[PDB]
Amino acid sequence: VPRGSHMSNQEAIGLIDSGVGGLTVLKEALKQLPNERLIYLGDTARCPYGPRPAEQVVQFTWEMADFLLKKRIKMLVIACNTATAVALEEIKAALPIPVVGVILPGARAAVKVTKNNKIGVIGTLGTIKSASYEIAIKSKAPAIEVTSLACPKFVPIVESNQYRSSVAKKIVAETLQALQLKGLDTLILGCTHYPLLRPVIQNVMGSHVTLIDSGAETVGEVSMLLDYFDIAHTPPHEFYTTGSAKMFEEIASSWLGIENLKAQQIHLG
Amino acid sequence: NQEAIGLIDSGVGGLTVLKEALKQLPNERLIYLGDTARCPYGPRPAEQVVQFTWEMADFLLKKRIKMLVIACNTATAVALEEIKAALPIPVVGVILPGARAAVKVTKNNKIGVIGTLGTIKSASYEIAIKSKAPAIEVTSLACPKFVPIVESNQYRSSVAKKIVAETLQALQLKGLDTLILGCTHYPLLRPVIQNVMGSHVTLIDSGAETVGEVSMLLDYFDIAHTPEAPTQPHEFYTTGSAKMFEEIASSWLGIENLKAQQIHLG
Numbered sequence A: 001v002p003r004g005s006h007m008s009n010q011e012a013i014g015l016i017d018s019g020v021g022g023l024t025v026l027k028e029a030l031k032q033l034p035n036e037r038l039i040y041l042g043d044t045a046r047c048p049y050g051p052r053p054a055e056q057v058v059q060f061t062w063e064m065a066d067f068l069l070k071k072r073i074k075m076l077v078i079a080c081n082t083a084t085a086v087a088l089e090e091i092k093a094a095l096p097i098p099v100v101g102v103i104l105p106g107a108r109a110a111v112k113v114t115k116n117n118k119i120g121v122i123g124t125l126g127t128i129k130s131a132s133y134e135i136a137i138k139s140k141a142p143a144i145e146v147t148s149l150a151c152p153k154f155v156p157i158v159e160s161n162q163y164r165s166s167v168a169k170k171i172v173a174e175t176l177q178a179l180q181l182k183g184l185d186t187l188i189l190g191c192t193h194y195p196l197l198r199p200v201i202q203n204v205m206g207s208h209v210t211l212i213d214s215g216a217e218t219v220g221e222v223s224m225l226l227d228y229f230d231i232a233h234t235p236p237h238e239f240y241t242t243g244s245a246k247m248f249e250e251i252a253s254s255w256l257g258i259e260n261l262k263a264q265q266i267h268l269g
Numbered sequence B: 001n002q003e004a005i006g007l008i009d010s011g012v013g014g015l016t017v018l019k020e021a022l023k024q025l026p027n028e029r030l031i032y033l034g035d036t037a038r039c040p041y042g043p044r045p046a047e048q049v050v051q052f053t054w055e056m057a058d059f060l061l062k063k064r065i066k067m068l069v070i071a072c073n074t075a076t077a078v079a080l081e082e083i084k085a086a087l088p089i090p091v092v093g094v095i096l097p098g099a100r101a102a103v104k105v106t107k108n109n110k111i112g113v114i115g116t117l118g119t120i121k122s123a124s125y126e127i128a129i130k131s132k133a134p135a136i137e138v139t140s141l142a143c144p145k146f147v148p149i150v151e152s153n154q155y156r157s158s159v160a161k162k163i164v165a166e167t168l169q170a171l172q173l174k175g176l177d178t179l180i181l182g183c184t185h186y187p188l189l190r191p192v193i194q195n196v197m198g199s200h201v202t203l204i205d206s207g208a209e210t211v212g213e214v215s216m217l218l219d220y221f222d223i224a225h226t227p228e229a230p231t232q233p234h235e236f237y238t239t240g241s242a243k244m245f246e247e248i249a250s251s252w253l254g255i256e257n258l259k260a261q262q263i264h265l266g
């Protein structure tokens, strides 16, 4: 632009995720931060990250972060709970721009909303094995009881378009019975895909349990940071994928309500 | 950073915010100042509230606090920007976190806020919300009788319930799905307000949201207390009667034998 580069605050916020699931976080940014320009990258060619070794996830997440940094983003959001669980500390420490992940904001919202100090979190194998949630919660409130439960079947339920089905209900109930002795009043949906399962999880957990949406809370934290440092955009979005642009578009355009949404396939390896 | 978080308010009402900090931030040491001798701020001119708020901030600054929370919505409405710009420590108020929470929770894009005359006159809520998410319709309503109801201690009475119903009658009609409790005192009225608005209106507690934000900021600025109990007690200061402050605070916070000191400002 004639100015040279864009004004710092006019640059995009970047979001990285293992695929299309992270569009639950992006959709929250469209809602809560409509003035911001967004650049999204999903590593669909290597999804899922859930079951992968931490070292692989850190590598792949760095490749995504490096790609978006070159696009002059003013802030990076690691939209993926699995990537946040193992990669956030290192990436945050290494970059000069704000870096936020999706675990801490959910943890803090859970501490805020709990009344009985019994909190659960569900997520991928990798997320839960990292113990990141237990650490994020107990760093601030060490006496809270935290129960962490991997739900590996949940991502595939959403991917197969069965997230409203009888099968979904049976699988969720079968898995979540592992929580039932813990007296929880709060459950963190610690995975990008779980908002699509929210009504099923709520039915299983009942009316006394408050569910926490990772993207919703993380986007609220982004909003806070933008305002605090006066770097909000003054009153198109870009989509990148390592898989098929068309297959990305079919999920995204409708999910997000952007009719002429075009995605671009890129290579990271 | 082992130094205290400071909280300032026009009186004892801001202990609704402090109570949230005890719950969400139990590792942190707190210093609270309430300007009881000049409470209420609600009906005062902006300029006067700014001066008083500066006096409070300056008093806690001398106590080596690492962060300042303006717990009072009325004070936040007029004084936050200038105090934040001037001080060498982070400063947070109670308005923006409520505004952000309301943007997050609304589904129908119809949000209300209630507060003192001062808070509502400032238009801080409307400005904050419209600068972030301008699709939202914001209804702002001053509720001048509410602080007196809570100050009277008779905030669960038939008289109180009638006044809340009368005051919010027009607001009930707006089809809101979210209502910000934009005043330190209003958590005390929350069940009555929820009964009047209906179970489908999500109420936003300023203090609860603000402390959640403080928690995130302590980690972001890398100034959180170590994960253990502090070694020095919380401290409580008032420009009114310490005896009265103690009686209210010990009961409300569940800290028996809490002690406060009376200080002078201005």
Ligand SMILES: CCCCOc1nc(NCCN2CCOCC2)c2ncn(Cc3c(F)cccc3F)c2n1
Pocket (backbone or CB within 6 Å): A019, A020, A021, A022, A023, A024, A044, A158, A159, A160, A161, A193, A196, A243, A244, A247, A248, A251, A255
């Ligand atoms: C926004 C959450 C996305 C959840 O994640 C996700 N991933 C898919 N596919 C994964 C592999 N694809 C990805 C695209 O590149 C090629 C390979 C889905 N297919 C149907 N639905 C179900 C579905 C849908 F079909 C539309 C909207 C939402 C949704 F969950 C899917 N949801």
Ligand SMILES: CCCCOc1nc(NCCN2CCOCC2)c2ncn(Cc3c(F)cccc3F)c2n1
Pocket (backbone or CB within 6 Å): B011, B012, B013, B014, B015, B016, B150, B151, B152, B153, B185, B188, B247, B248, B249, B251, B252
């Ligand atoms: C912060 C909420 C505190 C609510 O709790 C509380 N406790 C009190 N006293 C302690 C209870 N004792 C009193 C003597 O008999 C035995 C019990 C109060 N006195 C006035 N206000 C009312 C009041 C108020 F609720 C807010 C601000 C100012 C105020 F006076 C009080 N509110």
Ligand SMILES: N[C@H](CCC(=O)O)C(=O)O
Pocket (backbone or CB within 6 Å): A017, A018, A019, A021, A022, A047, A048, A049, A050, A051, A079, A080, A081, A082, A083, A123, A124, A127, A155, A190, A191, A192, A193
């Ligand atoms: N995006 C991942 C879910 C899919 C995956 O396993 O990569 C998460 O949020 O945990």
Ligand SMILES: N[C@H](CCC(=O)O)C(=O)O
Pocket (backbone or CB within 6 Å): B009, B010, B011, B013, B014, B039, B040, B041, B042, B043, B071, B072, B073, B074, B075, B115, B116, B119, B147, B182, B183, B184, B185
């Ligand atoms: N603390 C004030 C209410 C009491 C007053 O009017 O000073 C507020 O939050 O608006």
